[PDB]
Design a protein around this ligand. Structure first.
Ligand SMILES: Cc1cc2nc3c(=O)[nH]c(=O)nc-3n(C[C@H](O)[C@H](O)[C@H](O)COP(=O)(O)OP(=O)(O)OC[C@H]3O[C@@H](n4cnc5c(N)ncnc54)[C@H](O)[C@@H]3O)c2cc1C
Ligand SMILES: [Cl-]
Ligand SMILES: [Cl-]
Ligand SMILES: [Cl-]
Length: 255
């Protein structure tokens, strides 16, 4: 029984049942569903939206749960990074156990289907890993999905990297299908051995599939400066220009 239903296109309330810290500003949040056998019902590629009433406004933002129907019943799980002057993210970071959130879904133009592409090149920064992780996890857990995934995941320093151990476990499931490189612009520590710097044209050319590969797609999600930089790099590398309104058929798709 899926809780999200496009025919009942309204907000619904779900209570916070568990909260686990990932970093000083980021936690995993587990929200309860009405029945122990319920699943969220979120198609792969799509997100939920969460509404907070703040400063006289209904403010809504997109979140991609880390849980899938196939591994999570009776609840759903989100990763949320809170900012000091955030809005919806600040509300979430103020919830106590038992408080509820108002959500609506599913939403989004990315409708992932098994083997719809031969190779996904993923470019993520910060919480932009969330839409990527959902897709890679689905592909990892589907024993008939052969889609190659090459992810370049850029952050400023070590404490900003999210889901690294989870991602590495997905690689270990399909080590011939999945490739991840981590970049840090400015590592804090001398024991970083991943990539150094930000995601440049040269990084994308080295690590992601080329624009000439049949049925390839580039997926992008991150803060606006990263998105503008990497979009320009993909055009310079011969990918088709991402469309103002990203649609699933586009060669470069921005979340
Ligand atoms: C498809 C999609 C999936 C997403 N999934 C997730 C997810 O699973 N988890 C998650 O935590 N977020 C996710 N995001 C990001 C999320 O939608 C919000 O942008 C984020 O939570 C900030 O919302 P806000 O209302 O708190 O801040 P806003 O109202 O957007 O901004 C208010 C202030 O907060 C600060 N701020 C906001 N965003 C940033 C930022 N990126 N870096 C630095 N400061 C910032 C700035 O000071 C800004 O002025 C996703 C976004 C998309 C498009
Ligand atoms: Cl609506
Ligand atoms: Cl939306
Ligand atoms: Cl296109």
């Amino acid at each position: 029984k899926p809780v999200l239903d496009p025919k009942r296109n309204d907000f619904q309330s779900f209570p916070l049942v568990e909260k686990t810290i990932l970093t000083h500003n980021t936690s995993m949040y587990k929200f309860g569903l009405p029945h122990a056998d319920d699943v969220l019902g979120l198609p792969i590629g799509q997100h939920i939206v969460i509404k907070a009433n703040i400063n006289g406004k209904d403010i809504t933002r997109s979140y991609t749960p880390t849980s899938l129907d196939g591994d999570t019943k009776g609840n759903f799980e989100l990763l949320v990074k809170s900012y000091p002057t955030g809005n919806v993210s600040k509300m979430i970071g103020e919830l106590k156990i038992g408080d509820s959130i108002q959500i609506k879904g599913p939403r989004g133009n990315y409708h992932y289907e098994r083997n719809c592409r031969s190779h996904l090149g993923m470019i993520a920064g910060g919480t932009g890993i969330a839409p990527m992780y959902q897709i890679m996890k689905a592909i990892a857990m589907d024993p008939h999905d052969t889609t190659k995934v090459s992810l370049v995941f850029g952050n400023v320093h070590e404490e900003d990297i999210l889901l690294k151990k989870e991602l590495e476990a997905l690689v270990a499931m399909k080590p011939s299908q999945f490739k991840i490189v981590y970049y840090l612009d400015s590592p804090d520590r001398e024991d970083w051995t991943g990539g150094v710097g930000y995601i440049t044209k040269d990084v994308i050319k080295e690590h992601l599939p080329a624009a000439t590969m049949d049925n390839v797609q580039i997926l992008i999600c991150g803060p606006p400066a990263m998105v503008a930089s990497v979009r320009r790099s993909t055009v310079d590398l011969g990918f088709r220009r991402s469309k103002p309104l990203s649609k699933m058929e586009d060669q470069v798709f921005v979340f």
